Amino acid sequence: MDIDPYKEFGATVELLSFLPSDFFPSVRDLLDTAAALYRDALESPEHCSPHHTALRQAILCWGDLMTLATWVGTNLEDPASRDLVVSYVNTNVGLKFRQLLWFHISCLTFGRETVLEYLVSFGVWIRTPPAYRPPNAPILST
Amino acid sequence: MDIDPYKEFGATVELLSFLPSDFFPSVRDLLDTAAALYRDALESPEHCSPHHTALRQAILCWGDLMTLATWVGTNLEDPASRDLVVSYVNTNVGLKFRQLLWFHISCLTFGRETVLEYLVSFGVWIRTPPAYRPPNAPILSTL
Amino acid sequence: MDIDPYKEFGATVELLSFLPSDFFPSVRDLLDTAAALYRDALESPEHCSPHHTALRQAILCWGDLMTLATWVGTNLEDPASRDLVVSYVNTNVGLKFRQLLWFHISCLTFGRETVLEYLVSFGVWIRTPPAYRPPNAPILST
Amino acid sequence: MDIDPYKEFGATVELLSFLPSDFFPSVRDLLDTAAALYRDALESPEHCSPHHTALRQAILCWGDLMTLATWVGTNLEDPASRDLVVSYVNTNVGLKFRQLLWFHISCLTFGRETVLEYLVSFGVWIRTPPAYRPPNAPILSTL
Amino acid sequence: MDIDPYKEFGATVELLSFLPSDFFPSVRDLLDTAAALYRDALESPEHCSPHHTALRQAILCWGDLMTLATWVGTNLEDPASRDLVVSYVNTNVGLKFRQLLWFHISCLTFGRETVLEYLVSFGVWIRTPPAYRPPNAPILSTL
Amino acid sequence: MDIDPYKEFGATVELLSFLPSDFFPSVRDLLDTAAALYRDALESPEHCSPHHTALRQAILCWGDLMTLATWVGTNLEDPASRDLVVSYVNTNVGLKFRQLLWFHISCLTFGRETVLEYLVSFGVWIRTPPAYRPPNAPILST
Numbered sequence: 062m063d064i065d066p067y068k069e070f071g072a073t074v075e076l077l078s079f080l081p082s083d084f085f086p087s088v089r090d091l092l093d094t095a096a097a098l099y100r101d102a103l104e105s106p107e108h109c110s111p112h113h114t115a116l117r118q119a120i121l122c123w124g125d126l127m128t129l130a131t132w133v134g135t136n137l138e139d140p141a142s143r144d145l146v147v148s149y150v151n152t153n154v155g156l157k158f159r160q161l162l163w164f165h166i167s168c169l170t171f172g173r174e175t176v177l178e179y180l181v182s183f184g185v186w187i188r189t190p191p192a193y194r195p196p197n198a199p200i201l202s203t
Numbered sequence: 204m205d206i207d208p209y210k211e212f213g214a215t216v217e218l219l220s221f222l223p224s225d226f227f228p229s230v231r232d233l234l235d236t237a238a239a240l241y242r243d244a245l246e247s248p249e250h251c252s253p254h255h256t257a258l259r260q261a262i263l264c265w266g267d268l269m270t271l272a273t274w275v276g277t278n279l280e281d282p283a284s285r286d287l288v289v290s291y292v293n294t295n296v297g298l299k300f301r302q303l304l305w306f307h308i309s310c311l312t313f314g315r316e317t318v319l320e321y322l323v324s325f326g327v328w329i330r331t332p333p334a335y336r337p338p339n340a341p342i343l344s345t346l
Numbered sequence: 347m348d349i350d351p352y353k354e355f356g357a358t359v360e361l362l363s364f365l366p367s368d369f370f371p372s373v374r375d376l377l378d379t380a381a382a383l384y385r386d387a388l389e390s391p392e393h394c395s396p397h398h399t400a401l402r403q404a405i406l407c408w409g410d411l412m413t414l415a416t417w418v419g420t421n422l423e424d425p426a427s428r429d430l431v432v433s434y435v436n437t438n439v440g441l442k443f444r445q446l447l448w449f450h451i452s453c454l455t456f457g458r459e460t461v462l463e464y465l466v467s468f469g470v471w472i473r474t475p476p477a478y479r480p481p482n483a484p485i486l487s488t
Numbered sequence: 489m490d491i492d493p494y495k496e497f498g499a500t501v502e503l504l505s506f507l508p509s510d511f512f513p514s515v516r517d518l519l520d521t522a523a524a525l526y527r528d529a530l531e532s533p534e535h536c537s538p539h540h541t542a543l544r545q546a547i548l549c550w551g552d553l554m555t556l557a558t559w560v561g562t563n564l565e566d567p568a569s570r571d572l573v574v575s576y577v578n579t580n581v582g583l584k585f586r587q588l589l590w591f592h593i594s595c596l597t598f599g600r601e602t603v604l605e606y607l608v609s610f611g612v613w614i615r616t617p618p619a620y621r622p623p624n625a626p627i628l629s630t631l
Numbered sequence: 632m633d634i635d636p637y638k639e640f641g642a643t644v645e646l647l648s649f650l651p652s653d654f655f656p657s658v659r660d661l662l663d664t665a666a667a668l669y670r671d672a673l674e675s676p677e678h679c680s681p682h683h684t685a686l687r688q689a690i691l692c693w694g695d696l697m698t699l700a701t702w703v704g705t706n707l708e709d710p711a712s713r714d715l716v717v718s719y720v721n722t723n724v725g726l727k728f729r730q731l732l733w734f735h736i737s738c739l740t741f742g743r744e745t746v747l748e749y750l751v752s753f754g755v756w757i758r759t760p761p762a763y764r765p766p767n768a769p770i771l772s773t774l
Numbered sequence: 775m776d777i778d779p780y781k782e783f784g785a786t787v788e789l790l791s792f793l794p795s796d797f798f799p800s801v802r803d804l805l806d807t808a809a810a811l812y813r814d815a816l817e818s819p820e821h822c823s824p825h826h827t828a829l830r831q832a833i834l835c836w837g838d839l840m841t842l843a844t845w846v847g848t849n850l851e852d853p854a855s856r857d858l859v860v861s862y863v864n865t866n867v868g869l870k871f872r873q874l875l876w877f878h879i880s881c882l883t884f885g886r887e888t889v890l891e892y893l894v895s896f897g898v899w900i901r902t903p904p905a906y907r908p909p910n911a912p913i914l915s916t
Binding site: 632638670684691709713 | 775779782816821826828831835845854862863866870
Binding site: 347348349351353354377380381385388389390391392393396398399400402403404405406407410411414417418421422424426427428430431434435438439442 | 489490491493495496498519522523527530531532533534535538541542544545546547548549552553556559560563564565566568569572573576577580581584
């Protein structure tokens with residue numbers, strides 16, 4: 062089955078590709094905001110919304126990858142192999158999880174229809190020649 | 204966050220910890236089963252249910268771990284480290300995903316209440332020592 | 347053009363591949379079953395059902411492929427090229443026609459909704475570890 | 489089992505034999521015509537009509553035979569058998585599919601009764617010796 | 632995008648592919664006809680119909696290709712390359728625009744349903760080989 | 775017949791000339807946004823609006839010019855003639871198509887009356903002496 066991570070939330074992988082890969086906050090920043098604003102709802106034994114379910118799964122899977130990396134720091138004796146693996150898990154794998162955490166956290170904070178409109182607006186801004194592009198990028202707020 | 208993957212679905216990691224490692228099908232068998240019975244709901248633009256929501260994220264995140272095992276196979280030169288990292292993904296993380304996939308697929312197939320009464324009853328059977336335990340384990344079914 | 351032969355009948359090529367390849371009986375057993383149970387309906391001037399229309403076409407298409415294999419058998423002098431072609435018809439078209447004949451013969455015998463439920467049940471049963479499934483395999487019955 | 493494919497549609501192989509071998513268009517023209525007029529219905533989840541069901545199986549059986557010819561064109565180890573087997577598919581089985589595709593595409597386009605009266609009408613025309621045969625052969629059309 | 636220029640107007644590129652290259656008037660004849668019969672609708676601030684909308688874009692975009700052939704004539708020094716590029720625009724792209732202009736002009740002139748029934752009936756005539764085909768092609772008219 | 779490409783959409787060639795020729799995004803940028811946001815409506819066998827029809831025609835004509843350029847890359851042996859022709863098709867022809875794609879995409883995204891008001895507002899801004907001109911050019915958003 063070819064499943065898109067955003068289709069049920071009214072988006073698509075190609076739509077979230079309007080954002081550059083350097084736009085997203087680091088994984089530590091997103092997890093600190095998720096614990097500071099939604100820990101009460103995220104530990105809940107109920108479904109608050111589909112976005113909470115998705116975020117719970119994503120956080121547990123990031124924990125899995127982090128455990129892999131820590132276990133490779135403890136179980137791989139060849140330092141070159143070790144370094145390569147950790148770099149991959151935190152850089153190549155980290156970029157996908159960053160994007161996903163961003164999306165789900167931003168839909169809990171600002172609402173889903175607001176974040177989809179923001180992706181179109183930021184696309185129009187980055188598609189503009191920097192000369193004709195505002196010196197302030199679109200940002201999310203209320 | 205001390206998040207429990209089963210706590211929003213009426214279960215706990217302790218309730219599922221009673222199932223032995225030989226109880227679950229392989230990842231390939233579970234993924235083939237999710238394809239054969241729920242591809243029209245899984246690839247849908249509609250959530251379907253929180254079980255479908257949770258099953259999409261679980262199918263997608265295994266794919267990356269398969270991509271990590273593929274990348275390790277193709278990019279780590281040293282045979283000992285290549286084999287050791289590929290084995291860790293295949294057995295240790297594979298067991299946690301086998302349990303997670305099995306649970307969601309079974310709640311879609313039999314209903315959540317039936318899987319929860321089954322997990323309780325299987326718990327009583329597996330905690331009983333072999334000298335007093337009935338020879339055949341409980342079977343999960345539509346009742 | 348992307349027609350699926352089973353799509354019209356509530357199945358797919360993937361849903362018939364959920365059963366192991368060695369499950370399906372031989373083309374001879376299936377053709378003998380059709381010639382025993384449904385000869386009158388198959389040789390009728392009536393559309394008896396879309397399962398009858400589909401099975402009529404499938405018997406004729408296998409008949410041609412057999413004409414091709416027999417004609418190859420009589421008309422090629424080199425036994426190695428002759429064996430390669432007659433083998434490839436007997437094996438590779440063989441599985442596709444064994445699942446197609448089995449599906450339409452079973453739906454005439456047991457009903458479509460029964461055969462669709464059976465595909466799911468047997469495919470789940472064969473994948474369950476043997477200590478935790480009913481001791482005997484599922485079978486088709488009225 | 490002597491099944492005649494035309495019998496459930498009110499014809500026979502004998503009634504279609506009124507048309508000469510050189511009458512029927514090429515397979516590519518017939519498949520183009522099916523893709524032009526009835527792709528939506530052919531791709532459909534529905535039993536649109538018995539003519540759709542028959543035309544689906546014919547398109548698939550021709551695709552198989554072209555996969556046979558393509559597999560032969562790749563895998564063989566002798567030119568003489570390769571051309572002989574490929575030419576047999578293109579001509580001998582070709583003439584049978586050129587009449588089955590023509591019959592179902594015509595019945596979908598003009599109605600089955602129009603095509604049955606057309607076969608009888610063209611029979612009278614082609615049976616007439618060319619000294620007394622009128623210059624306008626019968627045709628299927630809207631006018 | 633796999634956009635079909637005729638798919639929003641009830642047709643396909645396959646349905647129009649049956650017309651032979653000698654069937655269409657020249658670009659100059661088609662452009663003269665669009666001028667002589669629909670200049671008050673074409674130069675209007677109102678859409679008129681999606682056929683008028685599509686016919687304006689088709690008239691304008693040929694003008695640029697005429698401007699490319701004019702610019703090539705005046706700016707490419709080498710005779711072989713000047714002639715070869717001018718010929719490619721005159722014959723090959725000209726044939727696709729002749730068909731596109733002819734279709735829009737005919738749907739304005741006769742109605743879309745009449746052009747679609749005509750394209751079907753002309754298809755039957757041109758697919759019939761010359762030995763059995765009536766001597767005169769079907770004629771497009773107001774019926 | 776002298777036809778203006780914008781009259782039926784309530785604009786004019788002279789009104790779109792308020793924008794500089796360096797304001798418009800590249801052809802690749804506009805076609806990526808048209809495929810990301812409207813491919814579903816653009817492949818539709820119906821008229822969604824006149825703007826969709828116009829955009830369909832424009833995209834097919836750009837494909838035509840691109841085919842001309844690729845065929846000149848394959849069929850013209852004199853490299854100087856070849857280079858000249860390709861430069862013209864992508865630079866001189868590309869600027870008109872850029873303008874048109876921009877207009878039609880922007881009217882699907884923001885509405886037609888909003889894009890006409892934007893042309894007047896950007897004209898007032900570029901007509902201002904840079905000293906009295908805001909350091910942020912007008913931009914299109916909701």
